[PDB]
């Protein structure tokens, strides 16, 4: 199959404003949210019907318990970071853990933290160490690296457990995740400011979101600037994007092993 990923995020907010949770934890398979938990609901809930349909109540009940523990731990860790930095008021703490199953069968794993939305600690599962961005992160790194059992446990979770969870979830959501919805592509030609013609290459209705679009002048890649539009969710499970140039021109689109040419 194509490359797929499993990730879980955690967000801790010290001193939240009214109506903002103190703790949120959300899971994703690729671009799809799969699970959700916050300090308000205090429950782990499915975010995909295929997650709800395939995991029995005991899964949700068990993880709700673990998340209530993780919630408390996150708060304590943000308080310790704030004291180290000597910061008052509202500050954020974040975590992203995950893995990828590449098309070739090879795998990647990641575990990282942020303080006020900036990189804080990066786990290196290959050297079994933490990369500290500053002196406070260094204090944490020294404490965490002294726990050898935790470093080893983490590498096994990243490399083995995560990949097995990803494979399980991929099977559950195969009708959503493993499908292909090809793009509908068009080219729009227009004279803009007098003398300057803009050519837009617009694609929509596609799934997965990963799409390559470029512009070529006589079979060779452009030497001028191409403006790229972001891959945006249309709201129906499909995506849209574009690529434009000014000025023999052709738009090239690659999506899920299928290549397309629109000669202008």
């Amino acid at each position, epitope marked *: 199959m194509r490359t797929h990923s499993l990730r879980y995020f955690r967000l801790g907010v010290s001193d939240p404003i009214h109506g903002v949770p103190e703790f949120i934890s959300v899971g994703y398979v690729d671009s799809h949210p799969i699970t959700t938990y916050d300090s308000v609901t205090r429950q782990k809930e499915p975010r995909a019907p295929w997650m709800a349909e395939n995991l029995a109540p005991d*899964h949700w*009940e*068990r*993880y709700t*318990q*673990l998340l*209530r*523990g993780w*919630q*408390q*731990m996150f708060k304590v860790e943000l308080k310790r970071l704030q004291r180290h930095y000597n910061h008052s008021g509202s500050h954020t703490y974040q975590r992203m853990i995950g893995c990828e199953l590449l098309e070739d069968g090879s795998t990647t794993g990641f575990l990282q933290y942020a303080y006020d939305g900036q990189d804080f600690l990066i786990f290196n599962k290959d050297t079994l160490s933490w990369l500290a961005v500053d002196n406070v992160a260094h204090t944490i790194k020294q404490a965490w690296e002294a*726990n*050898q*059992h*935790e*470093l*080893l*446990y*983490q*590498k*096994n*979770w990243l490399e*083995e*457990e995560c990949i*097995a*969870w990803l494979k399980r979830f991929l099977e559950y959501g195969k009708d959503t995740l493993q499908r292909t919805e090809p793009p509908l592509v068009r080219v729009n030609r227009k004279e803009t400011f007098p003398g300057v013609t803009a050519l837009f290459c617009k694609a929509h209705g596609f799934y997965p979101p990963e799409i390559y679009m470029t512009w070529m002048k006589n079979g060779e890649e452009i030497v001028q600037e191409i403006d790229y539009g972001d891959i945006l969710p249309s709201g129906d499970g499909t995506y849209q994007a574009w690529a434009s140039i000014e000025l023999l021109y052709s738009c090239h689109v690659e999506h899920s092993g299928v290549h397309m040419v629109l000669q202008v």
Partner: antibody, heavy 108, light 113 residues
């Protein structure tokens, strides 16, 4: 689902003993070895999560994830080593599943 | 580490009982197990942090209270002879690897008609 370890093992003092533990669990988050002397609380001996042998004095703990198996090796056996050795595994949902334990009798 | 009381108890069938457990290791995770001959420890109830508790494998005939972060009580509402066992309170910082489980000294309960 299952943690299997022998009910009892008898070895001679000064000798070596290997207490086996095979697990058949849904996921794996590490294996523990605990020692429990008769009428006392269990106490931690080791934790294994990656493959290989860890040597802590006269005691060694081995893990093979592909084989779903571990062993606790006790060298230069002493009478004080007569205890029950408990094997425990954290599964994919972090549930700590405990084996029935192995009673180790040392022959003087 | 993990302090539990009482070490021994004789109860008459139908009597209520409370086993107390305290840890001063600033641990989040807390457990109540029963140890019976021929089998591994069976989790009765557990508490993942202060403010939460959930059933284990054998919760029937028992209830718990995570009183605060330090204390986790086990209650037998109406003692039955099948509840004759050795009870262990345990604690850990978290559920992930890198967090050793610590046990109390044990509580032997004998329930008689």
């Amino acid at each position: 689902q299952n943690i299997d370890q022998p009910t009892e093992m008898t070895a001679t003092e000064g000798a070596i003993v290997q207490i086996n533990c095979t697990y058949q669990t849904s996921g794996f988050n590490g294996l523990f070895w605990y020692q429990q002397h008769a009428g006392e609380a269990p106490t931690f001996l080791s934790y294994n999560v990656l493959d290989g042998l860890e040597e802590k004095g006269r005691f060694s703990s081995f893990l093979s994830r592909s084989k779903g198996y571990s062993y606790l090796l006790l060298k230069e056996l002493q009478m004080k080593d007569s205890a029950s050795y408990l094997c425990a595994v954290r599964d994919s949902n972090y549930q700590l599943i405990w084996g029935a334990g192995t009673k180790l009798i040392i022959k003087p | 580490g993990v302090t539990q009381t009482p070490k021994f108890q004789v109860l008459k069938t139908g009597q209520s009982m409370t086993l107390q457990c305290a840890q001063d290791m600033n641990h989040n995770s807390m457990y109540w197990y029963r140890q019976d001959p021929g089998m591994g420890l069976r989790l009765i109830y557990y508490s993942a942090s202060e403010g939460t508790t959930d059933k284990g494998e054998v919760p029937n005939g028992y209830n718990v209270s995570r009183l605060n972060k330090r204390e986790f009580s086990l209650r037998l509402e109406s003692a039955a002879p099948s509840q004759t066992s050795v009870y262990f309170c345990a604690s850990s910082a978290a559920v992930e690897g890198g967090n050793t489980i610590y046990f109390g000294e044990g509580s032997r309960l004998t329930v008689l008609e």
